[PDB]
Amino acid sequence: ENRRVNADRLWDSLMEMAKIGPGVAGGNNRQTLTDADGEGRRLFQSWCEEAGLSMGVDKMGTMFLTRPGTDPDALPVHIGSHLDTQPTGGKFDGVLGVLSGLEAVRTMNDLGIKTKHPIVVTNWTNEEGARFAPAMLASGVFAGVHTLEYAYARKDPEGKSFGDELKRIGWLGDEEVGARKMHAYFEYHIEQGPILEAENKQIGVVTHCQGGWWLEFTLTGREAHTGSTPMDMRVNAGLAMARILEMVQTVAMENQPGAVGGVGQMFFSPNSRNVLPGKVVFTVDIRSPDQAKLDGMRARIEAEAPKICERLGVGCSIEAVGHCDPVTFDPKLVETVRGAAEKLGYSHMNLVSGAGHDACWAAKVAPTTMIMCPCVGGLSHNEAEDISREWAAAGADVLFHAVLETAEIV
Amino acid sequence: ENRRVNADRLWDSLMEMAKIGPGVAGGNNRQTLTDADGEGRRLFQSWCEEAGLSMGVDKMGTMFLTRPGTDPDALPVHIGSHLDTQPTGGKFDGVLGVLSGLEAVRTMNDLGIKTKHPIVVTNWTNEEGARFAPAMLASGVFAGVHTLEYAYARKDPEGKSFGDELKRIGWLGDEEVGARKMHAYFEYHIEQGPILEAENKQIGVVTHCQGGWWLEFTLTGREAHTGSTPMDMRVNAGLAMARILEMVQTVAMENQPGAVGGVGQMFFSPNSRNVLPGKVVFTVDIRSPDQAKLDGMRARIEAEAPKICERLGVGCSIEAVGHCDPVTFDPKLVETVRGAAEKLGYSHMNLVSGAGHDACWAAKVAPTTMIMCPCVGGLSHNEAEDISREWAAAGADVLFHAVLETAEIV
Ligand SMILES: NC(=O)N[C@@H](Cc1ccc(O)cc1)C(=O)O
Ligand SMILES: NC(=O)N[C@@H](Cc1ccc(O)cc1)C(=O)O
Ligand SMILES: [Cl-]
Ligand SMILES: [Zn+2]
Ligand SMILES: [Zn+2]
Ligand SMILES: [Zn+2]
Ligand SMILES: [Zn+2]
């Protein structure tokens, strides 16, 4: 209640990691299994070892940095997030949670605090799902949602497989994925939504996570000349994609509040200015806090889209390339978080997470919750993503205390 | 009337060139200024020199192969097309006209025919405008529509410039672009439309070319998280693009008959599945045989599209990256072509060309017309583009006789 993390030390570690794999506007382009990700993992590794943590790496490249407890038989409390970013990443999505875990350890060392349960700072591979789909791939293997082989065979847009890239940057570890058992899992993360800033609250007590689908459409047209083909003879997969995006906007807007839909990825083949496309590939991202509502939006998109296509002579094929159902966080750990906020005198409210997180898969296999701090305009997945020294430190303080309650001081 | 070209020799030259830069389905991917194009140009060069033609090359890489006439004062009759293809090219778009020119020369040699006017077989650089926009770039320089510098600075999607690529494959010539004066220019080309096949006509007597615009849209959104951004806070340039494609389909359909509108090329940035795009870039291709109608479709697309975008918070920027006005071919050469068809006993009808061609720029600077043969289902810019030995030869015969009438036998 007096005991606080070092704000300047946390902040300084965030500005140092921001320099690894810079974007073009003061954010980060440090995507999974690139060289810059390798550099980021090594920097994090070295900081952690100077803090007395010992490293284990699983076959999905997930890094576990351990601070032993006083009971050698006791299961660990993990503090988790990701160091991998979007191509237009901010400095804080993922990174905040991992380096807050480090700061909590450093503070314990500064105060010579021992715990019953070990504490394990965790960096999951390919949270973002920008380079290889799905998102939360490593934590999904951990929870048994995906096989190792399935994960290894994911390809980026240049055709490189996840497995090979992991091996290339040198982070294929020896531990079986998901062989570690957790006593509890905590994730500190920026909100990525406008609510905490708009309501003037310092801490978000995360109760639930909204679920989502990634539906990948492959539409088949007929390559043909854009100048000499009569309109009544075109098989236009581009127009079909256009009508499908409009229909997604309608489904989302007919399902307010608590529903989003949209598309961020799109490919045309062969992508010539005077050739109607033979393939159009894109991903629809739909999400709701409410399972039945999410099921209903999916069924509907999947029924209406083939009819848009059939009206145009266009072939339509859909694959789920990502899926997380809504999650309810562990009520006991939710109280610990609220309690830590109150003990510390920090304004707080409950919150549903808008994004998915590795925490959502962690909750399959262990008591789990999350903590959020505010971010400016709820902007995230943009280089302009912004938090203050003061916001970051507040939530880290809450993380510190929640973890100590759960790991048990001696 | 007895004198016909060698159908097996023409056809065999088409099947030989088809083996250079193969596609993935028995067409061709032999785009401008690739190594495959270098190889195609060299094969054509060697066939022409075996036929006693002498070569000049301009600074745009256009190849002029000359057969002398007996009048020292007389300007040449050119036979023109292109050997460069789309990524999903057929074996016949462009190639038919260039190798028919060669076949006509070989037949003149076989019959020992001399002409008053010299004959110049012409292969123009970057007709297709698939790799570098605009289309008909070299012939455009020739007719004075584009500067040499502007042409050299065109970039492909990987950032290579036209100028450098021309130099690399070894086709930068020494002649000033457009220094040659032509007496007349003829282009034999497949129809790329269904009409000749459907009407059971062997020869298309081309009277006009429909004109067109390439309008390149750059839409500006805000990169944002596709799960955690509320719908009322998204600036969705993808949805804006979707509504613009639908508006184009409406403008085209409301301008029937004689209007086409469509999109073959599209880029999203940064093209991650969970990041709404910051940039969406695409090209709208609009065409009409009627100038006022084409003008009107452009004004309308250019007025309605910024309003679609402004309603979504999206910034809108439009640049013309290609333009040819409707062309009326030289009526005297049109009669020569009709006459050759009649002399030979080939069924014929008039046609407006759906595509643009180098012929359209040639017509700025010399009497010009085109000859078409049928193609199956009017399918073109597709590897499955199809003509028969019999169709190809008939139109070449008409080319031969039209050119002889115009160049004048001795
Ligand atoms: N904070 C963050 O990196 N989160 C990702 C993870 C995710 C993506 C798709 C999905 O279906 C479930 C989770 C995001 O929601 O974009
Ligand atoms: N041979 C061929 O396929 N021709 C091209 C040329 C063209 C392109 C754009 C334009 O505005 C005018 C002409 C096509 O029609 O796409
Ligand atoms: Cl090449
Ligand atoms: Zn995250
Ligand atoms: Zn993220
Ligand atoms: Zn052509
Ligand atoms: Zn073409």
Numbering used by the authors:
A (entry chain A), B (entry chain B): 6 to 415
In the authors' words:
Together with hydantoinases, they make up a scalable and widely‐employed enzymatic cascade for the production of enantiopure (un)natural amino acids (=hydantoin process). Based on its reportedly moderate activity for N‐carbamoylated‐ l ‐tyrosine, we produced and purified SmLcar, a carbamoylase from Sinorhizobium meliloti strain CECT 4114. Using this artificial link between enzyme activity and bacterial proliferation, we evolved the carbamoylase SmLcar to accept carbamoylated m‐substituted tyrosine analogs.
To rationalize the massive performance improvements of our engineered carbamoylases, we obtained crystal structures for SmLcar and the double mutant SmLcar_GC. Guided by the electron densities of unknown small molecules bound to the active sites of SmLcar and SmLcar_GC, we performed docking studies (YASARA) with the synthetic precursor, cam‐3iY, for both enzymes. Comparing the resulting structures of the wild‐type and the evolved variant revealed a striking difference in the orientation of the substrate in their respective binding pockets. While our kinetic characterization reveals that this does not drastically alter the affinity of the ncAA precursor for the enzyme, as judged by the small differences in K M, this conformation appears to be highly beneficial for the attack of water at the adjacent metal‐binding site. Lastly, position 329 is distal to Gly217 and the introduced cysteine in SmLcar_GC (or Tyr in SmLcar_GY) interacts with the substrate to likely further lock it in an active conformation. The Leu217Gly substitution again proved crucial and boosted the turnover frequency (=0.23±0.01 s−1) and catalytic efficiency (89.9±13.2 M−1 s−1) by more than three and four orders of magnitude, respectively. When compared to the parent carbamoylase, SmLcar_GC displays a ≈70 000 times higher k cat and a ≈170 000‐fold improvement of k cat/K M. Combined, these results attest that our strategy of linking unrelated enzymatic activities to bacterial proliferation presents an effective means to engineer weakly active biocatalysts that do not fulfill a metabolic role.
